[PDB]
PDB file of N, CA and C and ligand atoms in Angstrom:
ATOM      1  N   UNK A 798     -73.609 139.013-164.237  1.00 18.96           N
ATOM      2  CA  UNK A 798     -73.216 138.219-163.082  1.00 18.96           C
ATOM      3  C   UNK A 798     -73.486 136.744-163.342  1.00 18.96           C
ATOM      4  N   UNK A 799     -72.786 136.149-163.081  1.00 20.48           N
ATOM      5  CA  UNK A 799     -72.742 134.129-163.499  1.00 20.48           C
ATOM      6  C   UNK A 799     -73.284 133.679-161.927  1.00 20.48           C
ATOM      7  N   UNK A 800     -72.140 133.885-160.751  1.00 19.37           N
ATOM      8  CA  UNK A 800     -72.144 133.618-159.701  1.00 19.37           C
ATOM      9  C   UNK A 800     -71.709 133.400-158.493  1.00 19.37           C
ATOM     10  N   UNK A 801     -72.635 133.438-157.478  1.00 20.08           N
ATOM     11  CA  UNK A 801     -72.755 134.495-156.173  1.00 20.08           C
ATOM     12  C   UNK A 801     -71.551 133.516-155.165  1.00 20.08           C
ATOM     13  N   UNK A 802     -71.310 134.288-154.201  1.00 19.32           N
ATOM     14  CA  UNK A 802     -70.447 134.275-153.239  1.00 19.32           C
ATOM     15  C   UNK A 802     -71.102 134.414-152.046  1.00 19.32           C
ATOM     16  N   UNK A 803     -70.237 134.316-150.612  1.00 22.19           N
ATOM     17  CA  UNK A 803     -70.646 134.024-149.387  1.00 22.19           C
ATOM     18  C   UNK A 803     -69.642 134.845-148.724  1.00 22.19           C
ATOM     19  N   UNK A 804     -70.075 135.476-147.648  1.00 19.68           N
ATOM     20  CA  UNK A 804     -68.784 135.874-146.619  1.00 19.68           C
ATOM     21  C   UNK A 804     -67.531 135.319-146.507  1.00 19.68           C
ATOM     22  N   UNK A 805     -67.562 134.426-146.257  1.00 20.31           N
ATOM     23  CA  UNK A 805     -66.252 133.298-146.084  1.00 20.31           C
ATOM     24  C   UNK A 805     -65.841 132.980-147.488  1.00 20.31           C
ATOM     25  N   UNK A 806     -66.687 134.046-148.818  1.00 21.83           N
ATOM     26  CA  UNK A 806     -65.728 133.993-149.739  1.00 21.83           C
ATOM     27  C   UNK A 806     -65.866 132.364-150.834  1.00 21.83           C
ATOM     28  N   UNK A 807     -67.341 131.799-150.883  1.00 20.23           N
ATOM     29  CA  UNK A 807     -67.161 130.504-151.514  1.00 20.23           C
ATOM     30  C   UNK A 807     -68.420 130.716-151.537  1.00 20.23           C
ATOM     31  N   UNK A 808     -68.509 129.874-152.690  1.00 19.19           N
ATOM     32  CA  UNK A 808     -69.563 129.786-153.585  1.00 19.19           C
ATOM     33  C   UNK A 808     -70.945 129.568-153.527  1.00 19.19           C
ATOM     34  N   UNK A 809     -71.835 130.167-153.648  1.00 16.56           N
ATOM     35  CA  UNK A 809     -73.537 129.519-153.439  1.00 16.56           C
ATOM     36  C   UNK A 809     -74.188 129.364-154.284  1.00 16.56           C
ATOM     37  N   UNK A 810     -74.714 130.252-155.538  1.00 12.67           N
ATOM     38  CA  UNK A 810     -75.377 130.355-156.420  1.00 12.67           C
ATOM     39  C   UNK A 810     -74.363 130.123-157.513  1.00 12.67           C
ATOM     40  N   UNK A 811     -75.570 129.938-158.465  1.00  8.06           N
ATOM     41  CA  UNK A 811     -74.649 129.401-160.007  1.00  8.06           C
ATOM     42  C   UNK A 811     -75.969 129.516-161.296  1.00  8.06           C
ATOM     43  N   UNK A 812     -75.934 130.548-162.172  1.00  8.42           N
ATOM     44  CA  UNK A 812     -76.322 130.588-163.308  1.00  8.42           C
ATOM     45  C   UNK A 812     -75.856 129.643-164.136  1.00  8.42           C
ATOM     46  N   UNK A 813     -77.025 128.601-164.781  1.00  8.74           N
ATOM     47  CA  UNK A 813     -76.712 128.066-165.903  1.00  8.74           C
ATOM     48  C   UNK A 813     -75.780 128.540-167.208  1.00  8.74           C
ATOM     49  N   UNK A 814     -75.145 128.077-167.423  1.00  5.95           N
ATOM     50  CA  UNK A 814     -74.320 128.581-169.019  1.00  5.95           C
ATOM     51  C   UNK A 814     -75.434 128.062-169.878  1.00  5.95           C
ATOM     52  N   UNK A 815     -76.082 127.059-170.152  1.00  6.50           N
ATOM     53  CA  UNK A 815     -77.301 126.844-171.018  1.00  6.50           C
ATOM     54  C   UNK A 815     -78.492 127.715-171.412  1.00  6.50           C
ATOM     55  N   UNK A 816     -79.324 127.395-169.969  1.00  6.38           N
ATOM     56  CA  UNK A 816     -80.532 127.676-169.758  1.00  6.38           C
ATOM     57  C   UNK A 816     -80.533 129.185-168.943  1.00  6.38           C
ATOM     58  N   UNK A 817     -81.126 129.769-169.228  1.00  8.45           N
ATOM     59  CA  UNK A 817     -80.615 131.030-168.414  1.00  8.45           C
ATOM     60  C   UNK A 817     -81.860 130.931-166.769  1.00  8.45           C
ATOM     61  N   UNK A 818     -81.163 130.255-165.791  1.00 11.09           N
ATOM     62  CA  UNK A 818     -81.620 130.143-164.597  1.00 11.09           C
ATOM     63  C   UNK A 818     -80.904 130.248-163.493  1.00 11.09           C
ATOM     64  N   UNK A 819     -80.924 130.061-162.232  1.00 12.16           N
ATOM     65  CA  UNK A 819     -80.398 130.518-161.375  1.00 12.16           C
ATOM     66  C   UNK A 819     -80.523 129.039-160.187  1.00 12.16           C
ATOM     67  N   UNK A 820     -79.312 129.027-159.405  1.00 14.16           N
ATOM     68  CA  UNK A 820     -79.324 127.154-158.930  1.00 14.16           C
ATOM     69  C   UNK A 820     -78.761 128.166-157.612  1.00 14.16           C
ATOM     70  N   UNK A 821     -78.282 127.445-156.341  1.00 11.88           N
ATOM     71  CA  UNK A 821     -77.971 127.624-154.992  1.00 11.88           C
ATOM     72  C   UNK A 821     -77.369 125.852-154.636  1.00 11.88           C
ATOM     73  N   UNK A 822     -76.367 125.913-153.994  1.00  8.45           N
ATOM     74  CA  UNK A 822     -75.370 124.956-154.215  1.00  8.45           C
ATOM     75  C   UNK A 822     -75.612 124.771-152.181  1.00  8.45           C
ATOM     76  N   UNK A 823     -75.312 124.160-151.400  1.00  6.83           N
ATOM     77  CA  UNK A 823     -74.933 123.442-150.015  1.00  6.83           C
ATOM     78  C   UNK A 823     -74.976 122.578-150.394  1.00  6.83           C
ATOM     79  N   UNK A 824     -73.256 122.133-149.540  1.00  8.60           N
ATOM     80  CA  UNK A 824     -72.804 121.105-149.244  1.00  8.60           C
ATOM     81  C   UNK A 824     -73.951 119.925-148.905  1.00  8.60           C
ATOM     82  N   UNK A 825     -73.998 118.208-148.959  1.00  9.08           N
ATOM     83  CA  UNK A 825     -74.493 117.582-148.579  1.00  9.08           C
ATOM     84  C   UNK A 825     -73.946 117.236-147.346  1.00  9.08           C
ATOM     85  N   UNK A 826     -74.955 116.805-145.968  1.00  9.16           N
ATOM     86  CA  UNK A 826     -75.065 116.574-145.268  1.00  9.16           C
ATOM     87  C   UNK A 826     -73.625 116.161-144.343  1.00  9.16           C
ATOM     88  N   UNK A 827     -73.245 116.653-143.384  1.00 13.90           N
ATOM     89  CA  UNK A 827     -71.537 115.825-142.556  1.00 13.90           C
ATOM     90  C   UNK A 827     -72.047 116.568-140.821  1.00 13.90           C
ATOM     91  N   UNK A 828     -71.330 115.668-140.058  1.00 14.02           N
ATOM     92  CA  UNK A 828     -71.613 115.639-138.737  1.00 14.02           C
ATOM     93  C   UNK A 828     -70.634 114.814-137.795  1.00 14.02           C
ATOM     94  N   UNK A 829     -70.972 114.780-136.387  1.00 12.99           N
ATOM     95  CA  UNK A 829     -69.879 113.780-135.872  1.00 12.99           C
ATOM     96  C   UNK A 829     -70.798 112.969-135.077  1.00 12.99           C
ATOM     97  N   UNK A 830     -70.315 111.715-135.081  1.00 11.14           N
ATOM     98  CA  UNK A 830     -70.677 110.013-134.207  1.00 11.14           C
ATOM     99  C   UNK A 830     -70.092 110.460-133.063  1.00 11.14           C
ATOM    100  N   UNK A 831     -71.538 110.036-132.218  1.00 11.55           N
ATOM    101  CA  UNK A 831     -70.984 109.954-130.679  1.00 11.55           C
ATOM    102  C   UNK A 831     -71.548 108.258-130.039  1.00 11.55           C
ATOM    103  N   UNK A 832     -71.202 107.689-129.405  1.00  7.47           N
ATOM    104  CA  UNK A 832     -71.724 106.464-128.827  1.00  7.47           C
ATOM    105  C   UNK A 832     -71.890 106.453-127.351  1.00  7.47           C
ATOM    106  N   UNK A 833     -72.892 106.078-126.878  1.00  8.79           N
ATOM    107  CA  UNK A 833     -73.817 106.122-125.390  1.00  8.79           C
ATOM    108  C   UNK A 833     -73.431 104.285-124.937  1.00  8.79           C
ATOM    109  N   UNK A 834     -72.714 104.317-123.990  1.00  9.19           N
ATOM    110  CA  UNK A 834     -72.459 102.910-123.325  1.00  9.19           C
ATOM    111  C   UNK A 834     -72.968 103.004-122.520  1.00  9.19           C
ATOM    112  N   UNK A 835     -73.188 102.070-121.263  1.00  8.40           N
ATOM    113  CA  UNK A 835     -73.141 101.270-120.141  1.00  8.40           C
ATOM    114  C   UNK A 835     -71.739 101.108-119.457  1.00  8.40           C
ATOM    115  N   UNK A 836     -71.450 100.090-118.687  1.00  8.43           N
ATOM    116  CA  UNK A 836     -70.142  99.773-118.655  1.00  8.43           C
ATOM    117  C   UNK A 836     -69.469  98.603-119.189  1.00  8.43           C
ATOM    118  N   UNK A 837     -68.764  98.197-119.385  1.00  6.91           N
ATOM    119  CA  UNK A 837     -68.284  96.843-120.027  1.00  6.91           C
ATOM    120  C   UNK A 837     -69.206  95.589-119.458  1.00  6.91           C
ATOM    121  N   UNK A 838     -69.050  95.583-118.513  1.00  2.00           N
ATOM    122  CA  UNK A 838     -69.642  94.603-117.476  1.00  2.00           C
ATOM    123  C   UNK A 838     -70.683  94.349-117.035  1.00  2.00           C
ATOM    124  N   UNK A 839     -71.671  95.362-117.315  1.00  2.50           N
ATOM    125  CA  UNK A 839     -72.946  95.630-117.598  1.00  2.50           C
ATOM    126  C   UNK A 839     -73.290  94.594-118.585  1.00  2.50           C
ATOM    127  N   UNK A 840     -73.395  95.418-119.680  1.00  2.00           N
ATOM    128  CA  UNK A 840     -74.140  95.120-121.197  1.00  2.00           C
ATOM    129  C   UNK A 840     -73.221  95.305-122.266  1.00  2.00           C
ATOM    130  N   UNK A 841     -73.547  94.807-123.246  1.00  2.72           N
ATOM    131  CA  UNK A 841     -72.669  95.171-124.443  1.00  2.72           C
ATOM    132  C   UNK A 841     -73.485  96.156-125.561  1.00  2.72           C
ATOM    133  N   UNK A 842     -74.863  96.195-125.100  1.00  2.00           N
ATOM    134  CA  UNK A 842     -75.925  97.070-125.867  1.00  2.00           C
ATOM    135  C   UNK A 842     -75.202  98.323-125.863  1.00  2.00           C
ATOM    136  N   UNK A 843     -75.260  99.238-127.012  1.00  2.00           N
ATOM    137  CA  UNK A 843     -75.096 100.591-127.049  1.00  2.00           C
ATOM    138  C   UNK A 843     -75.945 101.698-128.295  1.00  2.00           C
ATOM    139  N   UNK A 844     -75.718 102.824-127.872  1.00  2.00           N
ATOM    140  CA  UNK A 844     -76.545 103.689-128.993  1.00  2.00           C
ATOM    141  C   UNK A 844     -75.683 104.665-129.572  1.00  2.00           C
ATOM    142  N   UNK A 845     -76.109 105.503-130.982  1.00  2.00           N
ATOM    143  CA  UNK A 845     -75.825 106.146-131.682  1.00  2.00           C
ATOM    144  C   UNK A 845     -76.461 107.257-131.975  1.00  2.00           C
ATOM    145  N   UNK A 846     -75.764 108.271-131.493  1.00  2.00           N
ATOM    146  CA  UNK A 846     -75.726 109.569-131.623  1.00  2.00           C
ATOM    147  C   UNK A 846     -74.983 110.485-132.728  1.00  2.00           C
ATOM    148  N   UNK A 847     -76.171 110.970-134.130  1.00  3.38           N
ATOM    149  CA  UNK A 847     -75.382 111.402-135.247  1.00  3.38           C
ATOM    150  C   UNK A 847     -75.558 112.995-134.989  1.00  3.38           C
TER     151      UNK A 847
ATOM    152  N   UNK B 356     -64.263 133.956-137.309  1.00  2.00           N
ATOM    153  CA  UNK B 356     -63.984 134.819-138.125  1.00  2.00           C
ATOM    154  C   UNK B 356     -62.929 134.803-138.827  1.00  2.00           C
ATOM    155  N   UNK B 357     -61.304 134.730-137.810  1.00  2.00           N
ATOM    156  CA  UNK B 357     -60.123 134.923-138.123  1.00  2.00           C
ATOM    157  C   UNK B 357     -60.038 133.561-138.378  1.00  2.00           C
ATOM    158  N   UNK B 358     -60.344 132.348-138.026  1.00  2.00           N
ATOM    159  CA  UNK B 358     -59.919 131.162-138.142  1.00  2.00           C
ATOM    160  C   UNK B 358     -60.636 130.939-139.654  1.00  2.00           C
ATOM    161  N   UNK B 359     -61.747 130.939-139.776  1.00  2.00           N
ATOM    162  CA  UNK B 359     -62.442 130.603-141.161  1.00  2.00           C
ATOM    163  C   UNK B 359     -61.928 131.526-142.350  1.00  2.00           C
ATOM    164  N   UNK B 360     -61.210 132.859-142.413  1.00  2.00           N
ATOM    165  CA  UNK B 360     -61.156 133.502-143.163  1.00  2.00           C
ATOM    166  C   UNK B 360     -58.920 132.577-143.548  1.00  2.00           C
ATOM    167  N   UNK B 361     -58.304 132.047-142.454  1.00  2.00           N
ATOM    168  CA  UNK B 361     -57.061 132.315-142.556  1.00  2.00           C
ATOM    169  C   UNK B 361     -57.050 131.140-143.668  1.00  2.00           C
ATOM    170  N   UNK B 362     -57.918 130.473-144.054  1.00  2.00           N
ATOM    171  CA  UNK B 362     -57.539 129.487-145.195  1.00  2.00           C
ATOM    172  C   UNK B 362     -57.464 129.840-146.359  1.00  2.00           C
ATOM    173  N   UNK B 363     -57.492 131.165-146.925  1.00  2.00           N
ATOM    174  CA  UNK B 363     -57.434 131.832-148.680  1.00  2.00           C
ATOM    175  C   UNK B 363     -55.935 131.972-148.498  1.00  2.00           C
ATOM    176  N   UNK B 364     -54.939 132.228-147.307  1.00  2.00           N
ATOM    177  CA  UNK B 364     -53.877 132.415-147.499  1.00  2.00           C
ATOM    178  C   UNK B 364     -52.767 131.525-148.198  1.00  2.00           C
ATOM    179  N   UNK B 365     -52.146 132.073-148.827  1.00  2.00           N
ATOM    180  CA  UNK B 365     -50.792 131.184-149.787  1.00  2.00           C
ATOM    181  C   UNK B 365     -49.949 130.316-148.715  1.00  2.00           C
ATOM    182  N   UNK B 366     -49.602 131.015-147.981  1.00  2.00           N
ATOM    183  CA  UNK B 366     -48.417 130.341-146.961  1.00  2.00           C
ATOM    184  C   UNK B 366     -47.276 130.089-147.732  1.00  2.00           C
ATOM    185  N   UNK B 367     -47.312 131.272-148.539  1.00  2.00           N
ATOM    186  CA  UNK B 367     -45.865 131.184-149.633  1.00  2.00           C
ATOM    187  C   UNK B 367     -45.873 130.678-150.854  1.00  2.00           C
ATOM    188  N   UNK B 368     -46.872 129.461-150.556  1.00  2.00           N
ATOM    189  CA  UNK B 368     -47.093 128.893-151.892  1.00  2.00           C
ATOM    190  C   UNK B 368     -47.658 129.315-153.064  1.00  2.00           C
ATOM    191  N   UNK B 369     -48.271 128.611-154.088  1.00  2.00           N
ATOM    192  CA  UNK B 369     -48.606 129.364-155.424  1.00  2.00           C
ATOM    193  C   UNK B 369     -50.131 129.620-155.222  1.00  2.00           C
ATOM    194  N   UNK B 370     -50.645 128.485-154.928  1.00  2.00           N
ATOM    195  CA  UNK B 370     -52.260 129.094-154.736  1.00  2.00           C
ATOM    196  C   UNK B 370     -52.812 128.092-153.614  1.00  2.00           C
ATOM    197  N   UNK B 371     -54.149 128.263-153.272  1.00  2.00           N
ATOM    198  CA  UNK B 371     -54.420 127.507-151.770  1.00  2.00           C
ATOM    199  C   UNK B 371     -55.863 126.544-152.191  1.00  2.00           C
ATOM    200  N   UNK B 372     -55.499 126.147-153.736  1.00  2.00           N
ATOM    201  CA  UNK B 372     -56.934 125.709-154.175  1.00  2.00           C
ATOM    202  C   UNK B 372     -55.985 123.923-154.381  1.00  2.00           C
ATOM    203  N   UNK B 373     -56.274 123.066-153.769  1.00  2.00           N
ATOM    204  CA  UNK B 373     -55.555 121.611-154.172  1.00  2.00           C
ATOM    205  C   UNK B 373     -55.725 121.102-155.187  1.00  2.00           C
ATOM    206  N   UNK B 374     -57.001 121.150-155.986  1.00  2.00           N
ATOM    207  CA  UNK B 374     -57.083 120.354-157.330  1.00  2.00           C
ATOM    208  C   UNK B 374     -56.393 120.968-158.076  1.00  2.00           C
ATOM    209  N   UNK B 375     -56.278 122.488-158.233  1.00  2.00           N
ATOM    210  CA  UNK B 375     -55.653 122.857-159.266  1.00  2.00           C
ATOM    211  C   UNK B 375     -53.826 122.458-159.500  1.00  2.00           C
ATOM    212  N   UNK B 376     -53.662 122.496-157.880  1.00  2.00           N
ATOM    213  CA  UNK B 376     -51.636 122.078-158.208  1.00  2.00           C
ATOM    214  C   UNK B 376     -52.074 121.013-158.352  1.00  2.00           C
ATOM    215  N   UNK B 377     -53.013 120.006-158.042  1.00  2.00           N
ATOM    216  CA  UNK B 377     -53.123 118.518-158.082  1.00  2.00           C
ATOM    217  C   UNK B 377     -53.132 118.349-159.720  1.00  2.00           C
ATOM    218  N   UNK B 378     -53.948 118.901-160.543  1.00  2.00           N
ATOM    219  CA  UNK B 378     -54.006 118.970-162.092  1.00  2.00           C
ATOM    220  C   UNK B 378     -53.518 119.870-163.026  1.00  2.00           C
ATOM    221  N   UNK B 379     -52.416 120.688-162.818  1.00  2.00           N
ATOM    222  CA  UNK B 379     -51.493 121.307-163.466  1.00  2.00           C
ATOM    223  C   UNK B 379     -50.230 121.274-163.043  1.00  2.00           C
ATOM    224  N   UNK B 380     -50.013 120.655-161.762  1.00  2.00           N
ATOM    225  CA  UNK B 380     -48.759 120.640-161.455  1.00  2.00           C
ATOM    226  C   UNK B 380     -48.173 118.602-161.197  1.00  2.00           C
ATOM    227  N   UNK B 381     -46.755 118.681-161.428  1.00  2.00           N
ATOM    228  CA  UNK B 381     -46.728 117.094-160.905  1.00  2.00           C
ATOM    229  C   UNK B 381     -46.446 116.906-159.450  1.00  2.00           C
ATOM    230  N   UNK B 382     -46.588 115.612-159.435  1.00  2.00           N
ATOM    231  CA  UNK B 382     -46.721 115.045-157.941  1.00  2.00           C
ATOM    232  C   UNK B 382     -45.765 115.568-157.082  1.00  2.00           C
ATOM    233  N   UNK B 383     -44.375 115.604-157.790  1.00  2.00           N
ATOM    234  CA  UNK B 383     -42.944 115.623-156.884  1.00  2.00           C
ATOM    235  C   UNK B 383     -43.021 117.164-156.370  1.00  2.00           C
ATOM    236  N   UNK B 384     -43.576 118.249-157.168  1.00  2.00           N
ATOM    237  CA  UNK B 384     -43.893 119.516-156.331  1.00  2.00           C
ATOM    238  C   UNK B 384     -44.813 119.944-155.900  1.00  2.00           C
ATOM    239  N   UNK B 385     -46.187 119.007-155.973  1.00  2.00           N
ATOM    240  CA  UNK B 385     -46.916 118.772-155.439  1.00  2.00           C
ATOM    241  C   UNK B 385     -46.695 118.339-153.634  1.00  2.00           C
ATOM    242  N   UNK B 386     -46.034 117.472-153.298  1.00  2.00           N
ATOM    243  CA  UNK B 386     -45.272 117.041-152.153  1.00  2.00           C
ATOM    244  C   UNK B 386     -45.135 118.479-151.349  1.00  2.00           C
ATOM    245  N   UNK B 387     -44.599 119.423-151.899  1.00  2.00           N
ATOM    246  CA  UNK B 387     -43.872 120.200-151.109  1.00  2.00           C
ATOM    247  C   UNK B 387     -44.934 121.301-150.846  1.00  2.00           C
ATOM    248  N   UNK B 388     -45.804 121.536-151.770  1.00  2.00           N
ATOM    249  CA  UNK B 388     -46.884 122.615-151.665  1.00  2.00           C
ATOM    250  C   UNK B 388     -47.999 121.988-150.558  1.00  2.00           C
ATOM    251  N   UNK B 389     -48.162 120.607-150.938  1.00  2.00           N
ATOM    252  CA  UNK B 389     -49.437 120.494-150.035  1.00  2.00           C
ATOM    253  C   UNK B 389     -48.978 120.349-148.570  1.00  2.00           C
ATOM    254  N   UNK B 390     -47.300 120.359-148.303  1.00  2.00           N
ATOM    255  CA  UNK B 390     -46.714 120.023-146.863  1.00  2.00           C
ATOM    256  C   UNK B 390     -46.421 121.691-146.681  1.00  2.00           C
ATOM    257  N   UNK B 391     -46.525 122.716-147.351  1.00  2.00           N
ATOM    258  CA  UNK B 391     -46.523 124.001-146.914  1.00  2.00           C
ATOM    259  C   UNK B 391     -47.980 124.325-146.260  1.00  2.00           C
ATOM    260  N   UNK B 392     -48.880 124.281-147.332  1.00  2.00           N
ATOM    261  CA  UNK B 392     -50.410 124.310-146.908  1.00  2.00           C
ATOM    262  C   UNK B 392     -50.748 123.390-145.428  1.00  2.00           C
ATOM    263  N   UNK B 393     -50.467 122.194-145.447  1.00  2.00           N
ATOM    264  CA  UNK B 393     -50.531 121.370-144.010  1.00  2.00           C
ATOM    265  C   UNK B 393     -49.860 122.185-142.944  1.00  2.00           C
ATOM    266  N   UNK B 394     -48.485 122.323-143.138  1.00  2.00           N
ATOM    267  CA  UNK B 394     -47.975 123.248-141.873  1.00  2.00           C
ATOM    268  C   UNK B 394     -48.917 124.593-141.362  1.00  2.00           C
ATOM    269  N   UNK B 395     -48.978 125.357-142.880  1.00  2.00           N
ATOM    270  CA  UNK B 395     -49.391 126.296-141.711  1.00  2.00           C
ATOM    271  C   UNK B 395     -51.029 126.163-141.625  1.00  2.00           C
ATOM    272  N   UNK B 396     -51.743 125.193-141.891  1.00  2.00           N
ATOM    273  CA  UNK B 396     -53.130 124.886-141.215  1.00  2.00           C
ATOM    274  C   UNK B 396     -52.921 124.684-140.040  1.00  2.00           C
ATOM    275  N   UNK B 397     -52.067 123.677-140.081  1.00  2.00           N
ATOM    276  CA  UNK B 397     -51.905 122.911-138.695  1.00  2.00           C
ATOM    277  C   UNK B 397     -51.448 124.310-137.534  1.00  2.00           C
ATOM    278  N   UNK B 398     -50.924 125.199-138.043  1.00  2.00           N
ATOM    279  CA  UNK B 398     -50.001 126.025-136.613  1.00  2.00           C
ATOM    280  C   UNK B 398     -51.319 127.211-136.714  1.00  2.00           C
ATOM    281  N   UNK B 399     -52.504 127.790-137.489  1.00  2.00           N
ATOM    282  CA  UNK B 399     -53.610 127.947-137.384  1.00  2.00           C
ATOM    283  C   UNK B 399     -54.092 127.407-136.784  1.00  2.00           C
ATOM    284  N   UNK B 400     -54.795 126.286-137.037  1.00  2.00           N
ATOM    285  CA  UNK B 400     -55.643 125.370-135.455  1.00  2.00           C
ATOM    286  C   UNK B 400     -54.836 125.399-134.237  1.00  2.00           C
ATOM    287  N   UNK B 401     -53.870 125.050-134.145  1.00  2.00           N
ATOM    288  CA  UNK B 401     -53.059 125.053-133.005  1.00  2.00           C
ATOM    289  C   UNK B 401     -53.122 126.494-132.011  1.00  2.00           C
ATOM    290  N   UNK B 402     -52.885 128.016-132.895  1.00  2.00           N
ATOM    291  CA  UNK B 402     -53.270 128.852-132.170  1.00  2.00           C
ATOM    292  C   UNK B 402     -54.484 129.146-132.065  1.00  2.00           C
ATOM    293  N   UNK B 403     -55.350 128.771-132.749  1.00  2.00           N
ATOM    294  CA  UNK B 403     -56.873 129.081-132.305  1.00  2.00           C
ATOM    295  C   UNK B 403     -57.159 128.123-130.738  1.00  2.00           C
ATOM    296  N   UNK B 404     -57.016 126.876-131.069  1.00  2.00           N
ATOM    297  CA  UNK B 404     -56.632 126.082-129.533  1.00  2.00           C
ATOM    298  C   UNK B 404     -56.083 126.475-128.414  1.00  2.00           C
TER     299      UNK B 404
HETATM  300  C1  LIG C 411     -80.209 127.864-175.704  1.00  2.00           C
HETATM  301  O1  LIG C 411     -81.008 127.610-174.567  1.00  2.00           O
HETATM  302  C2  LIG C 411     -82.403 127.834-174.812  1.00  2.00           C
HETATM  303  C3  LIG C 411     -83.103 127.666-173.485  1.00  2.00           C
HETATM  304  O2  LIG C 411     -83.258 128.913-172.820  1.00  2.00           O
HETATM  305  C4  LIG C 411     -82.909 126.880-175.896  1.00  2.00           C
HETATM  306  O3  LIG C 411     -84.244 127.248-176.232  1.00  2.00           O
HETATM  307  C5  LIG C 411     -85.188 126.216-175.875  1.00  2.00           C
HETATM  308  O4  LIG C 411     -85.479 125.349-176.980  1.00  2.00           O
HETATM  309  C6  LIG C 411     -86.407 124.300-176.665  1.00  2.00           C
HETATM  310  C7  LIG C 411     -86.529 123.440-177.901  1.00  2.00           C
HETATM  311  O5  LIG C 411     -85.323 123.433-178.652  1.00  2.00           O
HETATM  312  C8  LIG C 411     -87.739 124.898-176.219  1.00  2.00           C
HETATM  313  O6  LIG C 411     -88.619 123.848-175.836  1.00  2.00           O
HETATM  314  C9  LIG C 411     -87.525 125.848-175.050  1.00  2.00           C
HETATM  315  O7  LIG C 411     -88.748 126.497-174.717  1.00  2.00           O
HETATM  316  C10 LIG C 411     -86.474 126.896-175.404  1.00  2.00           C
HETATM  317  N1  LIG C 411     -86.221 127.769-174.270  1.00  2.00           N
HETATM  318  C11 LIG C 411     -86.900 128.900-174.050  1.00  2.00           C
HETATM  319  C12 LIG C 411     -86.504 129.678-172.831  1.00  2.00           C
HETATM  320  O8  LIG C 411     -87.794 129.276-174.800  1.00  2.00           O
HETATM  321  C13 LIG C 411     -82.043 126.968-177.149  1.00  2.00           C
HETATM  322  O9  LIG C 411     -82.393 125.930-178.057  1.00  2.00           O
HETATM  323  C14 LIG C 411     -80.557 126.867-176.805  1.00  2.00           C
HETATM  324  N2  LIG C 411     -79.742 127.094-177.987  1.00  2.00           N
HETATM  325  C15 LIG C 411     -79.089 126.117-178.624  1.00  2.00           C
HETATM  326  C16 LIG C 411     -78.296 126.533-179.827  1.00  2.00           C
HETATM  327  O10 LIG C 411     -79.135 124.950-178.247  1.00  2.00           O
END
């Protein structure tokens, strides 16, 4: 066995072709921006929500 | 389930992996595969919506 799979069928683990070891792969980090106002007329201050 | 699994499908086309038509195939039929793959993503999300 080289390497492993996931339900959804994509990839996790991965044996070296070199070194004979064993690695586990996730994606780096993704998300969605949200922004927290006031009203226009208020303030122009606002915050960030990742 | 059904939504995460419907992306291995061809949608007619040759395969559903992009780099590979992107690097064995040229651009001009490239065009037409990745606008097969777009359609039927797009009518997937649409009925999951
Ligand atoms: C194949 O990979 C192995 C690693 O498993 C290499 O053996 C290593 O060699 C270095 C020095 O050359 C040692 O410090 C390591 O301890 C060795 N590994 C183990 C597990 O003992 C081997 O050299 C590689 N083969 C080739 C032809 O490069």
């Amino acid at each position: 066995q080289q390497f492993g799979r996931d339900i959804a069928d994509t990839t996790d683990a991965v044996r070296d072709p070199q070194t004979l070891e064993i690695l586990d792969i996730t994606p780096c980090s993704f998300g969605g921006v949200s922004v927290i106002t006031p009203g226009t007329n208020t303030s122009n201050q606002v915050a960030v929500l990742y | 389930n059904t939504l995460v699994k419907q992306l291995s499908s061809k949608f007619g086309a040759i395969s559903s992996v992009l780099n590979d038509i992107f690097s064995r195939l040229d651009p001009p039929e490239a065009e037409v595969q990745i606008d097969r793959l777009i359609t039927g993503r797009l009518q997937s999300l649409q009925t999951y919506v």
